[model samples]
Target: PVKPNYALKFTLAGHTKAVSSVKFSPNGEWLASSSADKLIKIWGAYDGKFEKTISGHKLGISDVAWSSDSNLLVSASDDKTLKIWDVSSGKCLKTLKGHSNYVFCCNFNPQSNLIVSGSFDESVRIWDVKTGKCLKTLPAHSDPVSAVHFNRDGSLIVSSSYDGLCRIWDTASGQCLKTLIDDDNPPVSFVKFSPNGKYILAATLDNTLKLWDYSKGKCLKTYTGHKNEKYCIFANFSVTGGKWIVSGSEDNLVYIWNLQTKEIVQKLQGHTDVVISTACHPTENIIASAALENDKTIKLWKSDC
Candidate 1:
């Protein structure tokens, strides 16, 4: 079998605990990683050099997201709050509080003025950066909300939950536009909207990742191969000049698929523990992945070709 052309670009370690998420800035300048150590670390995207740490959370961090302008960072934590950070100064600019339980996921709108987050309290909340206030609190899911994201235009938000449901909401009215779910009703651990705002991709606990036409409530395609029955393994898309789907796997590997054909094109093996999260470079062929407790590290992968 011919192996994929991917090569290890960097193997980084500094977090004392499991790294929960890694997000690349839209400008492709930095990589942000949040860990169970209750810290947010920033690094040079290409060189993988540790740049700075934005720390203030009382409990472990679950996820971090970068604004489209690459000037700000937001993080969700077990502390039951989300904090907005000024990326250049490493300052925790504002604290967003209201979630009764842990905040599991967060994202910034395309315009960066609005932020949305999912929490263990089964709610999806939106925030206004200028006002630093909660804009709306949506009683989102029956189970814990696992992931939340805004569409390209920032007109709608999509949320996934352990309730085995993925719901799309109208950003203005907070109305549930559609509820997308597989027939089997497997718990969805993570979900994301396509950059073009036409499709939805979800990572379910059933060892499969599915692509859906959200508005139609139809499951379009399913990609499988990596194990993911325990942890919250997430899938991401290539934002650059590529049509591919990449995901961190519980099998201790990173899987990349040919998006159109729904076939595994590569399996990146690096982590010794469950690979729970991944980030794709916006303008490059690089992919960053982080694992759980056993491997408190991040690995950056790139292709020579």
Candidate 2:
């Protein structure tokens, strides 16, 4: 039998506005998409069935994160807050407020005990999920902080910003550990720690994805092919072994780059507008993406190689 070459499997539709981000739960049993429509839709990850719609935010949602157990969800929005929801009951459990401007991205640590969010207020805030208290605020970047993620061990936090730099932070001390910057200093739209936690991948407004050695504070490679000058676009590593880098492009397609070779391996095309977000199942060959503007659908793909 031939190896599966990842192919478009289905489309998830319901949002009235462009989908801002889509992510699969840790168990890969549920998928969530947040939109500018001020709503979030949860779907059966494997079955592609619409499970529920969560509504309450007064403004557009910028990002969504699922707890490690897949029982709770955290969302950041332009309303300048982050909300925690019970996935089973679809109930808003708590509202977290701290950022003075739009909250752009959020994440749950591996332990699921806390939620970390980044914002246009140029800061990243750590929250106590149970008490709704802002435990720590790191003045992380000079410009709007676009994205934030905790390392696999939950010891470090990585943040990217319109300031054209990605900074590594000490989660416990609220200290800036390292700063990553390109010579051109292009705004970084998103950043993620590799599955192995050795490197960081950043999608920059300079129309490229850069791989960085977080510890050394050096850029290892720059993957370029797709256009990414606009939008809060992001990229991720393929699951299982993390051999490839997958990212959505402003060119209305998804680009997968060979991790070791830094070559454009696959381009998945279908959207009519910019592809803004992408996610890979943690233990499967499945990949999913969301787009901008008139393209309000979430598209799924699987290896048909």
Candidate 3:
């Protein structure tokens, strides 16, 4: 286990362009990444050594994720395609194509064997992972689907869009449960559910984090303090009883806030560019953040607060 209050012992770098996505294998022994340079590289998670470079996408990769079993890796790209690869052999298994616009992000549903992808086409499509067949297309967002996610229990899938709204979808019936709109903004970058599956946290261009009671379908509270726009926010109740909420903003700061007190707890200062994504350690108060810029950097920090 990671020593608490100590700096992360691991660091890795290689991409010559902005790294769009980074994922660790199930065993936490391998790290896979993709960049705007049109390359995918897998590295030794502990040693930070390059293992192999994957190439074939004619355009920049947008996002990447590993299968729960850690045997397969899938990536979405600006080239309008989704490619699935074998983690061990580094062989491209399937290149699923259909979208007319850029495929921004792709992820596998944790509860069921389904691959979901969001795009600039203003839709979220669900696919059969085993057959590579498109199963359903959800036309919920008026603009591009920025991010798509399912709650831990797999009962609802939430999505955010450039149209400045977040909607919750019923996975089985393909019906919208709620549409969250912040009439004052144009771009609401990302939205996520709290670990308990009760509250939803949204990061928007308004430079604040809005907390909503999902069941009540109302905005309960709003948290702010980032010098600039907060682009992404994530929470893990399993780590600290849902007491902390970690967020990154365009102001180039990563701040952790106390949900109970609605106050800033700790500020992680390191990245020089906007932090677009953050991955919290499964059961520890540690976080790994991905910075979006030509620098192409990822940093790991320990949250002592």
Candidate 4:
């Protein structure tokens, strides 16, 4: 067996509109894609074959997060709701209804017992996974909230907004702790905690991604070189190498950077339109990326010996 790097593998297509997000199941058994087409598509992780279509959201799906156990999934939608599903059957398990406007992003806590979500209504919510209860609702943002994620222990959460800022919160108390701002103050369209939970990586509209020190609220590194002048694109850590940051760009490219050196290791090009989202398999050296409406396809890239 040879370690994999960056070779194009599969180009899966089915969405009717712009693809919004792509995610690999935590257990590495499935790959999921959501679209503004109002559909959620699931593929076999090992084979890159379409396995199911989850259709129940009344409007466009903005993002999907897999449960830590990989048995359930939660989707945030333009329908103003977050719906939970059984990953095995693609059946709607429960609907989390409360946000007054479109739901933009969601994530299951590492414990898999709770869900934290952000909405166009400028609110952030904490939901009880098993009971489908909205436990806390904090007036979380000035503009539509774009991204949200939990720290390793699920004790804290980080949220980003079109308001041009990011905030850290105490998950249990719903208390706002710190606000991260750049001098340029560009909208932070995407943000997440580093896997170890010590730093924050934010994708700001200025076409730059900055890493922040979680304890001091100071930027430790800045990565630039990809075109993301406009659009709510997402970038994430690649778990296989566990030392690379991957992002989708307005330039229709997938840029992977050295985790510490702030250098581009590879930029995968194939999409004909803006690449909106990129996800990495938890174990394999495989990546999944999707382009916007103009392309409407999911391309899988893997390494070859």
Deviating ranges (above 4 Å) for candidate 2: 1-4
TM-score for each prediction? 0.97, 0.96, 0.87, 0.96
The residue pairs in collision within model 2 are 3-305, 4-304, 4-305, 5-304, 5-305
Report the lDDT tens digits of candidate 1 across residue range 1-305. Answer: 12346789899899999999999988889999999999999999999999987889999999999887889888999999999999888888999998999999999998999999999899999999877899999998999998899998999999999889999999999999998856689889988898789999998888999889988888888999989998887788874645788898877998988888888888887789999998888888888999999999999988743
The alpha-carbon root-mean-square deviation between model 4 and the true structure, to one decimal in Å, is 1.9
For residues 151-247, could you state the per-residue lDDT of candidate 4 as single tens digits? Answer: 9899999999988989999988999999886677888889999888899889888889889996897888889999887888888876665478889
Clashes of 2: 5
Once model 3 is optimally superposed onto the true structure by TM-score, how far is the C-alpha of residue 89 displaced, in angstroms?
Answer: 1.5
**What is residue 196's positional error in candidate 2, in angstroms?**
1.5
- Comparing 1 and 3 by lDDT, which wins? 1
Q: lDDT, candidate 1, residue 292?
A: 95
The true-structure Cα RMSD of candidate 2 reads 1.6
Please give the lDDT score at residue 305 for candidate 1. 31
**Model 4: how far is 52 from its true place, Å?**
0.9
Instruction: Put down candidate 2 lDDT per residue, 1-305, tens digits, no spaces.
Output: 11236888889989999899999999879899999999999987777889899999999998999999999999999999999999889899999988999998999999989889999889999999899899999988889988999999899999999888888888888898898766779888889898789998888887888889978878888899888787778788885544788888888998988877887777898899989899989778899999887788899898843
Candidate 4: where are CA atoms >4 Å away?
1-4
Return model 3's CA RMSD, one decimal.
3.2
